[PDB]
Structure formats: structure tokens, C-alpha cells
């Protein structure tokens, strides 16, 4: 039942993640975004539906929350500037191994 991808490996019971097999701790909401990100690995995710499902529909806040969260994901797992979680200008983000 464990969800794995390239170098990111996830367990659904204790909700930890293996990044190339070395331990890493992360914030809860960031785990929720990565859990979205791994269910739809190779599927493009746009800010609206991510906000709809992971975030509470009543979110009247500003949109910079999700890009800041993706920045945290970058600095946590994808240290290199070129990374597996790609950003699409005005279309959102997607998980894919670099080709």
C-alpha cells in the first residue's frame, strides 16, 4: 500500500516519507500536498483544485500559501534547482522524473 516514486517513498500509516531512503521530517499540510502530489504523479495539479481538496473550501486567504508550501517542499526534498516537482506558469505543478 506504500506509495513510492523515483526517490520519494511514502507510507500511509505513520505518514513519513523516504527521500532516497534517508529520514526526513515535514510539516503536516506539506505532507498533505505531497500526498496529493503522489496520488497524481505525472498528473498536472493546479492551485484551484489543490486548494479545494487539501485546503478547506472556506479558505479566504491569499494565494501565496501554496507557492510557499511548494518552496518548502523544494528546500526539503528537491535541493537542486532543477527538480522532479515541476512548476507550470499559471497551470500549477506536476511530479515527473527529469527526462
Amino acid at each position: 500500500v506504500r506509495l513510492t516514486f523515483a526517490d520519494i517513498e511514502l507510507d500511509e500509516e505513520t505518514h513519513e516519507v523516504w527521500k532516497a531512503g534517508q529520514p526526513v521530517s515535514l510539516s503536516p499540510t506539506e505532507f498533505t500536498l505531497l500526498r496529493y502530489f503522489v496520488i497524481n504523479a505525472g498528473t498536472v495539479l493546479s492551485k484551484p483544485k489543490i486548494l479545494d481538496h487539501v485546503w478547506r473550501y472556506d479558505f479566504g486567504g491569499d494565494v501565496n500559501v501554496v507557492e510557499s508550501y511548494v518552496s518548502y517542499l523544494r528546500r526539503k526534498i528537491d535541493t537542486g534547482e532543477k527538480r522532479l516537482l515541476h512548476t507550470l506558469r499559471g497551470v500549477g505543478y506536476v511530479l515527473r522524473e527529469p527526462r
Partner: protein, 87 residues
């Protein structure tokens, strides 16, 4: 005569817009006005987000959030079923 009115689709469309207004009145009046001016319902002119802001005194990003709220609450299946059958 192709241009002749079939007289059934027109009546159907009249009840159809009645159903539309009834459904949108369920939504908030602010959201209802947003979608009305968004697609040109009261008029024939769909309007840009800045017009919605200047008629609501709000930034365009908040109208984007309002549009997100509208088409999300609209997908709620009670609206979906009662509007799907009419096609």
C-alpha cells in the same frame, strides 16, 4: 424555414433561465452578481474582473477566489442533478 422558431426550444429556454435564476439565488447574492456580470446575464456583455472589482470595491484576485467559490459550490450534486436533466 430553418430560421423559423420551433416554439418548443424557446419555451424550454424560458423555463431554463427560470431554473438558472432559482439555482443561483441559492448562492450568495454577492456570488450571484459576480457570475451574472461574469457571463453577461443581466446584459449581453460579459465583464472583465476589474469591472467586477470596481463595482464591488475589491481586487481582481478576490474576484478570482469568488469565482472559485461559485463554481465549486455549484458542482455540489444537488445543483448538478437539477441542472443536468435540462439537456
Amino acid at each position: 424555414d430553418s430560421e423559423a422558431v420551433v416554439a418548443v426550444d424557446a419555451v424550454s429556454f424560458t423555463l431554463l433561465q427560470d431554473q438558472l435564476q432559482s439555482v443561483l439565488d441559492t448562492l450568495s447574492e454577492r456570488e450571484a452578481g459576480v457570475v451574472r456580470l461574469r457571463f453577461g446575464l443581466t446584459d449581453g456583455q460579459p465583464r472583465t474582473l476589474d469591472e467586477i472589482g470596481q463595482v464591488y470595491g475589491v481586487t481582481r484576485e478576490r474576484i478570482r477566489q469568488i469565482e472559485s467559490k461559485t463554481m465549486s459550490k455549484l458542482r455540489h450534486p444537488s445543483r448538478s442533478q437539477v441542472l443536468r436533466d435540462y439537456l
